[PDB]
Structure 1
Amino acid sequence: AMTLLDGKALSAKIKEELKEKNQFLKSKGIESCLAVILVGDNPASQTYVKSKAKACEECGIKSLVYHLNENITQNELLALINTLNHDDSVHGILVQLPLPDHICKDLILESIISSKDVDGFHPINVGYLNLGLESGFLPCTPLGVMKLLKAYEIDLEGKDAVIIGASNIVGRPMATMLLNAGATVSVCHIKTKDLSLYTRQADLIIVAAGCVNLLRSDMVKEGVIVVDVGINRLESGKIVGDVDFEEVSKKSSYITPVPGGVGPMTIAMLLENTVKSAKNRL
């Protein structure tokens, strides 16, 4: 038949657990604290951030939200991170992506102390993951996807998996986590000649491209597992994914809704990571 990969329900269960954890840390002096850094007033980024803070309060995590100017300098951005780096009351530090062009994204993410790198974008944490290690912080989206799939006991060893989209935020670590899980992985992107060739033979497809209706009924096999990471806003103001959900869901054994699939899972992983960092202080 067909079964919804419902990250909404799943994330709620996680927040409950983190509620409990923080109470305990909070008693033992450790008040779990995420510092979020927002650059410029892009209302979409502002969206992700509001939600991020709202999630934190929901489950006893102290949010620190630095909404600073779009034009602030690299050194100012850097000096804030330095301070946060050495601020024992701060357990995670996250830069909201993307950043202004005049700023070197990599230097910035690399300058966050790797033990507070809750987004998992610091080179050494990327390295750990690509090595098959769980010795660090894993990026929240790909992590949320795995936790979700693992909740539905979807076995991954040996599957034919296709990741559509090759970004550092999603695609690449997604691929690495699948491959660490024993899956065969194909990574496709804007330059892939014929995407359908990979998608038709795929047991599992992760879509993370930023293109409305990129994945269609005639590109997927009956009983495919489809995870839709994409988030797009139409004229309607209506938020949809990269997958044509109507036509593709009829053919899927399991499939993420949008919204309510990967989104809430992303947020939940950001929370788990922040608390894992807090836990270490003990």
Structure 2
Amino acid sequence: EAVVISGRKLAQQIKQEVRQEVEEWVASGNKRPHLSVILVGENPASHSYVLNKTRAAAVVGINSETIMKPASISEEELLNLINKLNNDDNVDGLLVQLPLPEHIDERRICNAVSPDKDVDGFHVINVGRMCLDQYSMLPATPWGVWEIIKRTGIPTLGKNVVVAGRSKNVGMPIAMLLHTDGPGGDATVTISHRYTPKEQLKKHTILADIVISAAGIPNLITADMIKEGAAVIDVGINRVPKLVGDVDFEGVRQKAGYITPVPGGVGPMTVAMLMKNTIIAAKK
């Protein structure tokens, strides 16, 4: 039987460290960290995820505010709001929850957030810093995946990692961290493409010690794709009427040596790492 990694437990431990770190930082006389989140429109997933983030902020000692704007906002008002928060010395972290309405250019918005406040690491400069090991702040979901691996003690050096991504924004940053020299796993990394044949993907997963699925299709990762003892980390978000990941949990539970559940796996880790990035931002 596979070990089932509790994302909740690891996040809870990570959040406890941030509280300790935030409390000491305030005990030295500094301003309490503040995180601002801009939420546009009404994606139910987005509101749910943003509520998780501000809940986690309060219980770790980080002040927070969510600014909700209707979807009919223009790109110019969103830029004015971002520019205001960039200049607010009480605001340490600023993130924009994605996706944005189609009439707004996401890349323009993410590049308008000040790079010192970019707790998501979506600004072009922070993407470059991550590539070049200059960083201060790492994208929360890739860093969350890495902490699951590292804190569980799963070996990466020289190992075979496969990342099944829906987009390059998602699979490449995960791959980059595991490929980086030891954050960084010294691992061989395969990044499967969109619409890649499942059996073509299979010939890569069969070899993998660590399969990381972030494609958003149900049952992409079944037992006939895993060698025994392989760690399987589920990043998929799927509605099928309930939430599931990319892995057939009960099936792969037999074959695999490690498996993360959805919910309760990567999700809580994403939120927890965002807390780490916010204290980092408040410290400069």
Q: Distance in 1 between matches of 2:178 and 2:205?
A: 16
Superposition TM-score, scaled by structure 2 size: 0.94
Taking the TM superposition and a 5 Å limit, the aligned residue runs for 1:84-233 are 84-131=85-132, 133-180=133-180, 181-193=185-197, 194-233=200-239
Partner of 2:257: 253
Q: Note the residue ranges of structure 1 that are not aligned, 5 or more in a row.
A: none
Q: Distance in 1 between matches of 2:163 and 2:85?
A: 35
Query: Does the CA contact (< 8 Å) of 2:166 and 2:216 recur in 1?
Result: no
SS at match of 1:186: strand
Q: Distance in 2 between matches of 1:267 and 1:169?
A: 18
- RMSD, aligned α-carbons: 1.3
Cα displacement string for residues 137-191 of structure 1 (whole angstroms, at most 9, x for unaligned residues): 1110110111111112212111111000153542110010111021111111223
Letter of the aligned partner of 2:101 in structure 1? P
Query: Does the CA contact (< 8 Å) of 1:164 and 1:206 recur in 2?
Result: yes
Letter of the aligned partner of 1:207 in structure 2? S
Matched, 1:279 2:279: no
Q: Distance in 2 between matches of 1:23 and 1:223?
A: 40
Query: Does the CA contact (< 8 Å) of 1:161 and 1:185 recur in 2?
Result: yes
Matched, 1:59 2:63: no
Q: Distance in 1 between matches of 2:128 and 2:166?
A: 16
Q: Note the residue ranges of structure 2 that are not aligned, 5 or more in a row.
A: none
Q: Distance in 1 between matches of 2:127 and 2:206?
A: 30
Letter of the aligned partner of 1:258 in structure 2? V
Cα displacement string for residues 169-214 of structure 1 (whole angstroms, at most 9, x for unaligned residues): 4211001011102111111122324211111111111000111111
SS at match of 2:191: strand
Letter of the aligned partner of 1:253 in structure 2? G
Change (3 A) 1:183 1:272: same
Q: Distance in 1 between matches of 2:12 and 2:232?
A: 22
Identity of aligned residues (%): 48
Query: Does the CA contact (< 8 Å) of 1:216 and 1:244 recur in 2?
Result: yes
How many aligned positions are there? Answer: 277
Letter of the aligned partner of 2:252 in structure 1? V
Query: Does the CA contact (< 8 Å) of 1:139 and 1:169 recur in 2?
Result: no
Partner of 1:264: 268
Q: Bigger CA drift: 103-112 or 191-200?
A: 191-200
SS at match of 2:42: coil
Letter of the aligned partner of 1:99 in structure 2? L
Q: Distance in 2 between matches of 1:150 and 1:256?
A: 14
